[PDB]
Amino acid sequence: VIWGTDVNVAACKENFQRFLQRFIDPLYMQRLGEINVIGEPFLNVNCEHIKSFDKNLYRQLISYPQEVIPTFDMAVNEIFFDRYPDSILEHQIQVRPFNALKTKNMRNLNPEDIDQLITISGMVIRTSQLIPEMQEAFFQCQVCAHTTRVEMDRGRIAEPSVCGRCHTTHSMALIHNRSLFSDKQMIKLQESPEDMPAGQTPHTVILFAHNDLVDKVQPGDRVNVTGIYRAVPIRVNPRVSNVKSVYKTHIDVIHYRKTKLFSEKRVELLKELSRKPDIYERLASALAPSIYEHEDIKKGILLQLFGGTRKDFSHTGRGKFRAEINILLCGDPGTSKSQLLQYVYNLVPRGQYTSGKGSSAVGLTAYVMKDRQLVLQTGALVLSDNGICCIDEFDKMNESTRSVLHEVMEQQTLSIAKAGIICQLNARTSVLAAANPIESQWNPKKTTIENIQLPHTLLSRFDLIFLMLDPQDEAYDRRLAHHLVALYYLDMAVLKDYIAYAHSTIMPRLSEEASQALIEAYVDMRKIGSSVSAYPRQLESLIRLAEAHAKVRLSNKVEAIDVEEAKRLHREALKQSATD
Amino acid sequence: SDQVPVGNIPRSITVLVEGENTRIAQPGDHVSVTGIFLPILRVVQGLLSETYLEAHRIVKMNLTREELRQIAEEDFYEKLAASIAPEIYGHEDVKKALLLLLVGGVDQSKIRGNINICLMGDPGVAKSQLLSYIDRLAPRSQYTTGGLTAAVLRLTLEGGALVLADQGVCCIDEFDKMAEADRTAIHEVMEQQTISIAKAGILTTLNARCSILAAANPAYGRYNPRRSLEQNIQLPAALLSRFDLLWLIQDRPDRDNDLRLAQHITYVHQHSRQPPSQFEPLDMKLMRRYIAMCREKQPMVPESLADYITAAYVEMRREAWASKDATYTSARTLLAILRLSTALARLRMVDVVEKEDVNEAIRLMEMSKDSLL
Amino acid sequence: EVRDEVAEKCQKLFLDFLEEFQSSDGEIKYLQLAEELIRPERNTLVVSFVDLEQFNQQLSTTIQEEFYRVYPYLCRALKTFVKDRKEIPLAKDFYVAFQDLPTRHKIRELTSSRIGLLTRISGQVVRTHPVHPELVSGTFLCLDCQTVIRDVEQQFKYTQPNICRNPVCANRRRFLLDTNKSRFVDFQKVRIQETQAELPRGSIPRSLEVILRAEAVESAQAGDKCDFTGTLIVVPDVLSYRLVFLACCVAPTNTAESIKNQMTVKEWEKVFEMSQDKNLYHNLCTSLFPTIHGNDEVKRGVLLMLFGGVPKTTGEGTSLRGDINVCIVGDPSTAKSQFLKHVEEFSPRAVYTSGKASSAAGLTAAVVRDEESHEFVIEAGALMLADNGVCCIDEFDKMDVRDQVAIHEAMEQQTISITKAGVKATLNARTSILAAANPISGHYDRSKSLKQNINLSAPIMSRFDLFFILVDECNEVTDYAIARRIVDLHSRIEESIDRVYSLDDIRRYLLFARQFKPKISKESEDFIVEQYKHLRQRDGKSSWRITVRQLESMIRLSEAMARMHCCDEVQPKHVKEAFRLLNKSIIRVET
Amino acid sequence: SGFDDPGIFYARKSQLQRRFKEFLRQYRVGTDRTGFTFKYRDELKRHYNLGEYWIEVEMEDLASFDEDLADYLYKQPAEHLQLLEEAAKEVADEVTRPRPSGEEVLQDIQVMLKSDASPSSIRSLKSDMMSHLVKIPGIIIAASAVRAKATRISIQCRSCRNTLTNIAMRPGLEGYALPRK
């Protein structure tokens, strides 16, 4: 065996080659045919299959990944020289294993795991251009043009310092383009923040795609990266050979996995309680228990959590539909709006919290910045591409920001003309905006536009405008206080799993009952407004709400009850916003 | 803080944690370390070399009968209040309020036991001097003017004075002139008792539990009652509501009371001591011992008190509706009143909040509102 | 004193290719091209890649693999070939411009493997930089030994000589440059990116800068699409290196007979059927906007905008517009942006944007400081990106004044002449504009004139060929029918559409129809005159008055409608229908 | 903390040393009837049980066992002789591994060598055979008093105190070589 290891080249190759041919879910030889037909010589492998097939080889694999992988390549190439012995390929088959060790708490990583293959889930934050890394430097004498090359002198390139033909002093200068190069794109990735237990100090690591798997993942992608953990010294000065006793560590990526749920008991349990007739009311009341005397608002945000079913309108040429729900909660200061956003943001997965001010630390926009790599820093909206962005003080925002919010609400994407090029960053978020009335309190008889002073277009894009006020009712003050002092002296986990499963599995589809009910609702609203009348945007909101309400019941189809309650809440939002 | 004498300042010691000992501490942790003190060489009459402490073990740490008789005195807390900056003539009700902040709340279960107090008023009203006495009296404290928040130095997390409070008190003079970014930061502190900072877009969150004692002045000279609150001061009115109490000081020329203060000053000049009060001020160590005893207590709120508490709350909320200007009454106001009452119960060394404690807290709340006159 | 045998051999064979290979006529084309090249302002010899392959296949392969190594030698071969062939000036550069390379890589294909080898690519220019002389062969002079160091080639950076030319002397640090003696070549940097066709959905397009020299310096302009022949090369940057594609020659990206023969027989049959299909007008409108109820005049107006009229140029060097400008003003909702979204989605070369855009370009060309270089660069705007295309601009009432006046110049001239900070340039802009806006206060007061109902300037309104006023009707029938259309659209996730003509079939039909240049029959000339008498006779009161510009829109519509059914001549049927639409497009004041 | 220096821890000459080692210990003489005795191994044990600490060596026997090794000794006697000495040192130790107390400390060996090949005339000599094994006949004419010459030597810097121990002075009539500073 190679020194300091338990690794036999032939036996490991034979065992791996045996695993390729002999497997129980044989799929490896089938995708070998796909690679032979397609010609893409990279054969990615789930390492857990090797664990199931042979844990010792899997253990042996992880211990010495750099050494075992060439054996794996030799196994597959000879298999390709066995299966499809004749073919044409620009390079022979490679392998990109993945999904081996879910020690994904990058905050919990140790020097014990140096040069051991690992996979971790995280969100790529910053990227770069593929670094042209020199690997063989052609050289030419200034005196006699002596042609020579130096090949892979251990990262650095050894200067000749003396010619070979005329043998003069140092005259052989490198020729850049004649030199050989490879691609090494550097990538900076943040540890998956939801996965972290505390999150008090989110972790970031550098990654490198060397000559392969380059540029395939753009910033903001929450993916599982699999590669070899690696550490290197750093010279105290470039000129001197002294180095620090501490090594900065990075990853040489091998595979990117773009990214069942729970066990049978949870799906059984959530399906059991879904059958409760008042699950919609219980879940609404159960949502945010610290709140008191708010049910319409709780139901609306609850429908926003479930959201409408994803709809692919590519065939229609109509563009992407805003399947997500955006609700603006407008109410007096001290009315629990901030607590509602914090509770939802804390509860919700892959969500974000920001404030309308530009002083918000996260920032609701993405823009370039130089280290001096002019690299793009993302935004909370782009970060919450599928999550929920809880925006506080939405009334106090800049017009440039308001234009951005109109765009993403109109498109669920953000267009940024970085440098000169333009990029459309998808943001399919659910926007939980919170605004407060201008002046000390909300002046009655003044419209939301008057008392918040925002464009009619942008506020109209919000499917729901929930108006809440603190009434001047001492009984309400008395009951609220008793509720608080009662609190002075269902768990969120089950509700979170319910919503996640409903997102994952249940995708409500329309019923003609829902179709006719919605059409009846809109024309009734049109007739009421015939004498701020009805608009087809209101129909779209009613469409989305019924999808969410159907998703709440896990019916997997939109029913008339979804339409009826959606119209009820839509009228409640109208009643809350009614002014005439 | 206790180690440093008043005339001195804290001194740092680099410590090298290694192996299993790592990850066992965070900034602001009041830890105790055991290890070897050794030199590191990163030549006059011998070599000069920086020192450090190689870490071995790390641990994150947390009277007489006559004293009890003094505690049993009904004017005990009043005597303690008089002992808070006795040279500062007047403002005794404020001095009581400062005492409540020093003891803080209970944090029963949780509840935000911190008592953030903001002070506004014309320059030259003992405001700055009051904070200094509190910092001296405080067992653990930080003083700042407006760094305040954490940072990622270049590659290390360096905690600001807000973090270094850590359930102490972060006295903040010149509060009105704070950077608006810091205003947002302290908003999070009063909201969640945490500080989120992102130098490299990495929202690192630090447990900044502490009570914030703010001090500001109205712009353009002295306060103008004809000009509304926040008309003379350039702070978000919402942030003012976040404070548990907000006391206003106005330079009303009152020839008699001003003369009384002048008499107080002249005595201090002629004696280097305040005039002999009814109860003499006590040594700060004795005060801190009483505070430490008060932190031992966590008085509860019986549900019978809730009926009267809610009765008082709706009454003052009605007064707010009667007031032409909204007086910031809300559930925030109720919760603060709960903090004050249980804080008073800690001063009483009684594990049940009394109606007396509730009433006095309302009195201070009313006076703070009356200060807005 | 070391000779590259491969480059020397390649040079000789390339010289043999120049002086033996010939056209189908049997005469040496490259002698004639060199004969043309003797004139001033002419130094790049255009050469077909396949020709040198046919002359010597191995020569092409060696040039392909070793383009950087051998290309300087080919320039020497051209210099020797051109110097003796005629009285060429002794001192001016000569270049070999290659083209017709079958290998058209995408930008994503580019790797370190492609450094130094010949290659062709296609993409869209983003921004263009000024021209700059740049030293290529330094002529230095040591301070101490006073030996003029010459032929010290610089690899695109200030590379001084390694040591003194005199071996005895070891100054090594004080090589004074001779500016005049050192060889200089003009380089212009231009940014390019992947075209929309090559760009995957939701993926950031690649960006690359290219160096332009010789006649290729201003071959292209900002915001256009072009194919670039040359090689990828490495340049050091502050052992770091970065990739730039030196495009030796550049061409624009990619007759009715040529398309029809290029078109497959089945595609030919469908297109010929579509042209033969009478009443294609309405049936295509229904197909193009399946998720729409009513507003068929909008669908018809959009389709005519898609076809566009026949552009013409007078003998006085004045351009008569071919395309048109169409605006839609409507109440909140009412599907304007949805109409624009359908147009942008279906149509290639169609770009969607909004009047709220705050980018540096601001929908048009701009002269903006480089973040890194700190010099100004010509950044093209989406109007420039949509040159010979379509711009689906939203919130047209909410545009910027600088953009509005700049857009006014574009529609006025079909070009924009930009000058700022000493930099000066002009760019063609022949783009059909689809404006979407809303009335003032959101709701259209039909009792008020259109000028009163919107904030747009009168010249801008005058220069818009068509207007569509979409008022929020309280009519339940339209509201119910739209609701059924939307609900069936949502409920029937797909197949709700009724596309009598497939989208690709329409697109190829647009291309084949666009090859035509329909003429105006003398019947149509008088009928156009007669219809303009009717409009002048109408004289209203209209929301806007009548001028000669109305006739200009009328003829551009009639040319488009002669292009609709591929007929190469306008008929009175086309003219009256155009008169019907535009006259219907006039909304009289309903006070 | 930089105040202490940890010590670094851990054609082919070692291959040649192995070749001598196997040759000395594993060379067999005699036959099956007389036993295939290990001449050098037994003589070494005899010689180290006694105080001889030398061995005769038959160059022809080395040639028969390994022609290349003898050729190397002819070509470059000095280096290969030294390696042969180290092999002789090693094989002697393992042969006599359980030496009596104190005697376990090991003493070097003079590997004396003989060749049955004929001598060469001293008149037939050239510088080509410098650093080459030579064999000649003759009669001795004079002898010197036996003395002690230093092979392992150590010196101290007189002022700096820098000590340079275990310096090897090559055998022969060579002088000393002091440090520069």
Ligand SMILES: Nc1ncnc2c1ncn2[C@@H]1O[C@H](COP(=O)(O)OP(=O)(O)OP(=O)(O)O)[C@@H](O)[C@H]1O
């Ligand atoms: N209807 C209610 N039910 C329960 N708690 C309430 C209700 N109204 C107010 N509260 C309580 O009042 C306090 C309001 O705090 P919070 O900061 O969340 O208010 P807010 O209205 O969002 O404030 P702002 O708009 O000033 O940011 C919290 O204690 C909240 O629990």
Ligand SMILES: Nc1ncnc2c1ncn2[C@@H]1O[C@H](COP(=O)(O)OP(=O)(O)OP(=O)(O)O)[C@@H](O)[C@H]1O
């Ligand atoms: N009520 C008071 N009783 C006793 N001394 C007072 C009182 N008010 C002010 N002083 C004295 O005023 C002197 C100078 O003013 P002082 O330091 O109190 O200002 P300040 O209120 O901190 O002002 P600012 O916040 O504007 O800097 C102090 O030495 C303090 O002793």
Ligand SMILES: Nc1ncnc2c1ncn2[C@@H]1O[C@H](COP(=O)(O)OP(=O)(O)OP(=O)(O)O)[C@@H](O)[C@H]1O
């Ligand atoms: N006449 C109509 N026929 C069919 N669908 C319609 C019609 N008018 C509106 N709609 C529907 O209205 C829905 C919402 O309209 P949309 O968001 O496209 O409006 P918009 O034109 O962008 O509005 P605005 O720019 O005034 O805010 C669209 O999905 C479209 O299906």
Ligand SMILES: [Mg+2]
């Ligand atoms: Mg729109």
Ligand SMILES: [Zn+2]
């Ligand atoms: Zn040379």
Ligand SMILES: [Zn+2]
């Ligand atoms: Zn010189």
